[PDB]
Design a protein around this ligand. Structure first.
Ligand SMILES: O=C(O)CCc1ccccc1
Length: 126
């Protein structure tokens, strides 16, 4: 069901949260080799999450579930805000700019925290 597809998407999102916090610890400790690997792992988790969200939104549209489509249009827009901040973070790492990396990391944390009440609303709406 689309609802169980959203639970699968939610779990992939939680996996990225877990890997992100582990990446943050490694960054603070200066373990750049670990950070590089965690960033690759996160890039894969976001690409997976983004595609699953796209399938869920498309399915909601085909089902005519207007409220779920509204919420998923907002949530996918916000996901892209997080994604853009991720890609800038990756570039900051490549460039050795730890000041920008710290900035983009905190912003990504606050954008994600903000998007959580909506994430829970979608589960109920599908
Ligand atoms: O953290 C997010 O909100 C998603 C970030 C993301 C999404 C898709 C590709 C790269 C990063």
């Amino acid at each position: 069901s689309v609802k169980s597809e959203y639970a699968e998407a939610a779990a992939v999102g939680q996996e990225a949260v877990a890997v992100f916090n582990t990446m943050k610890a490694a960054f603070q400790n200066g373990d750049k080799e670990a950070v590089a690997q965690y960033l690759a792992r996160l890039a894969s988790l976001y690409t997976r999450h983004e595609e699953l969200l796209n399938r869920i939104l498309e399915k909601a549209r085909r089902e005519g579930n207007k409220e779920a489509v509204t919420l998923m249009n907002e949530f996918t827009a916000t996901f892209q805000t997080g994604k853009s901040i991720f890609n800038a973070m990756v570039a900051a790492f490549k460039n050795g700019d730890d000041d920008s990396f710290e900035s983009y990391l905190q912003a990504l944390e606050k954008v994600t925290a903000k998007g959580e009440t909506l994430a829970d609303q979608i589960a109920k709406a599908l």
